[PDB]
């Protein structure tokens with residue numbers, strides 16, 4: 001159709017079939033800019049973009065996708081010295097892709113952005129500490145809250161995931177138990 005209102009909704013529909021097709025259509029139509037920050041903002045603002053497609057797009061290895069993903073994470077504010085809440089805010093927006101390589105890029109950038117927003121912060125010696133913790137949380141919430149895993153990961157098990165070879169860049173066990181309790185009682189969701 002003709003009205004820009006309709007064009008945006010058509011782009012959104014097209015994105016839901018194939019993200020890059022939706023983006024290009026909107027760019028052709030003069031409805032969307034061409035920088036990573038333009039696309040990232042679009043991704044943040046349009047709640048009707050399909051959750052799974054946003055995850056696959058943000059996690060994709062192509063150069064342009066990664067730049068969009070960086071800008072997308074940079075438009076979050078992760079202040080407050082509250083790691084899990086930060087991660088929950090991040091993962092409210094879309095559905096994590098399945099491919100481990102994708103989760104890995106997403107978790108690495110999440111961790112870098114978290115520390116950048118918490119510079120006086122104390123627990124995490126390096127981005128790697130944060131990245132490993134974040135990844136362990138994804139694994140924990142998948143293990144605890146997927147009925148296909150019948151032997152659930154235990155608190156002792158979880159703590160092991162977060163050791164070696166850093167061994168001082170390593171997190172207190174009391175902190176890992178508290179996170180375990182938090183994730184066991186309240187799954188990571190989009191809702």
Ligand SMILES: [Ca+2]
Nearest residue numbers: 089090091093
């Ligand atoms: Ca988000």
Ligand SMILES: [Ca+2]
Nearest residue numbers: 091094095096
């Ligand atoms: Ca999610």
